[PDB]
Design a protein around this ligand. Structure first.
Ligand code: ZN
Length: 462
RNA sequence: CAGGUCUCU
RNA sequence: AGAGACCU
């Protein structure tokens, strides 16, 4: 992606959009019990912790664009992925505004706890003022779809969250692009059934993990991904995407049967307009992280990317022997012979993609099941039942989370969730974690799950 | 102060 | 109907 221009709002006639400037995060009662290196992200240009210009660092992620149109590898790549999707039988027909607004068995309803975006969020109009769970009213939606139209600008905000000390020094917080309610509704009408099918089918047919439950899914992955593993990381994935990948996505949607009216909506996320504070800017390429379909479209494009890199990097690649699952930019894949990712990374460079060794490794090493990660979790065979696989969130990560809160009223639920993650690391690690919690007065007031109870419930899942 | 998935009372 | 965990 690449910023095409920046203009003052006066010049463009867009309302200003300001976000909160102080973090909601505060040190928790456990802050000094556990070690950790993360602090709330820089939210303000005048943050004492900064070491660079804030706004400069914020938009450095739009590194630029290489290809605008598909070459032959990408075309073949897209067609291979699109054919594989055909067996899913995605319903290319348009979903109903009520279903799109209020949800289905495989698609959650539009979030009403959350901003309506441009221009409502500056006219003091909340989504609860337009929709109603209990009515399933679509009557006010239709009205505002007509008053304000589609292709409304995204509203740029900085993300309030823990970040490592380095990224706080270097001002590399993340940006969130608030969609307009109008475009969410309409994208959900055009692609709702695709979303539904994807959510229902995590695995190697969709090539996607959206909708997986790591407790159970992790036992399936070494069967779905047989042979030699490969993996790697992306830097600035969403923003590094050139328009060719949106052209490639259009190819897939077409091949599985979407109308041209449906396929036309892709250009409206490849080319977007954003308001940050008092300015308007234009972005070409780059996924707008905050549009409907963000996780799924990023995942689909990733499926195209991997295929294209393989056949352009190596000779004799049979794409039918590829197995992969993606969650946005996160990927785990296998092939019947080892794949050198150093060479894939070099081809990736020509495509404007920056690919690094899996898991912040210094160099591209071998990936096996003992050191692979996915959604940050390792893979650890159960000592009693080795075919049952524990997802393992690292204790270091869990320590970072517990050292802060945004609202100490819900401390019980926070610590419980971490316990659900911790116990997979084993009895010894879990009792060490629990007893550190107990070492402090509110720690003795919490209801903490029993290890063998967690385990027994896990086994019952099968 | 966005789009989502997962889990819990 | 609440809450938390995790991906962008
Ligand atoms: Zn533009």
């Amino acid at each position: 992606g690449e910023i095409q221009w920046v203009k003052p709002n006066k010049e463009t006639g867009r309302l200003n959009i300001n976000g909160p400037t102080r973090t909601k995060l505060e040190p928790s009662v456990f802050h000094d019990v556990f070690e950790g290196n993360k602090e709330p992200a820089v939210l303000h240009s005048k943050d004492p912790r900064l070491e660079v210009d804030f706004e400069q660092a914020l938009f450095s992620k739009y590194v630029g664009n290489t290809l605008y149109e598909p070459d032959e590898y990408i075309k073949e790549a897209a067609l291979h992925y699109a054919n594989q999707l055909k067996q899913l039988d995605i319903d290319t027909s348009q979903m109903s505004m009520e279903e799109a607004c209020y949800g289905t068995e495989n698609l959650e309803a539009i979030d009403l706890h959350t901003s309506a975006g441009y221009p409502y969020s500056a006219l003091g109009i909340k989504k609860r003022d337009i929709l109603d769970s209990t009515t399933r009213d679509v009557s006010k939606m239709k009205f505002y779809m007509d008053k304000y139209g589609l292709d409304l600008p995204y509203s740029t905000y900085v993300k309030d969250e823990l970040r490592s000390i380095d990224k706080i020094k270097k001002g590399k917080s993340r940006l969130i692009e608030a969609s307009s309610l109008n475009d969410s509704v309409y994208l959900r009408m055009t692609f709702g059934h695709l979303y539904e099918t994807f959510h229902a089918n995590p695995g190697t047919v969709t090539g996607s993990a959206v909708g997986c439950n790591p407790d159970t899914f992790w036992s399936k992955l070494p069967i779905l991904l047989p042979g030699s593993l490969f993996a790697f990381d992306y830097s600035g994935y969403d923003a590094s995407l050139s328009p060719v990948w949106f052209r490639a996505l259009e190819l897939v949607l077409r091949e599985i049967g979407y109308s041209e009216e449906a396929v036309s909506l892709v250009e409206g996320i490849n080319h977007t307009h954003h308001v940050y504070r008092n300015k308007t800017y234009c972005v070409l390429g780059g996924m707008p992280s905050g549009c409907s379909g963000t996780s799924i479209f990023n995942s689909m494009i990733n499926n195209i990317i991997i295929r294209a890199l393989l056949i352009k990097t190596f000779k004799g690649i049979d794409l039918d022997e590829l197995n992969m699952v993606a969650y946005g930019d996160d990927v785990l894949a296998s092939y019947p012979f080892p794949i050198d990712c150093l060479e894939l990374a070099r081809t990736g460079k020509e495509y404007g993609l920056t690919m690094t060794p899996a898991d912040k490794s210094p160099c591209f090493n071998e990936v096996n099941w003992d050191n692979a990660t996915f959604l940050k979790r390792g893979f650890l065979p159960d000592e009693q039942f080795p075919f049952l696989i524990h997802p393992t969130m690292p204790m270091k990560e869990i320590h970072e989370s517990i050292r802060w809160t945004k609202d100490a009223r819900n401390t019980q639920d926070h610590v419980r969730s971490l316990c659900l993650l911790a116990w997979h690391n084993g009895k010894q690690e879990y009792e060490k974690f629990v007893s550190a919690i107990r070492s402090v007065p509110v720690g003795k007031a919490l209801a903490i799950p029993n290890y063998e109870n967690l385990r027994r419930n896990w086994l019952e899942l099968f």
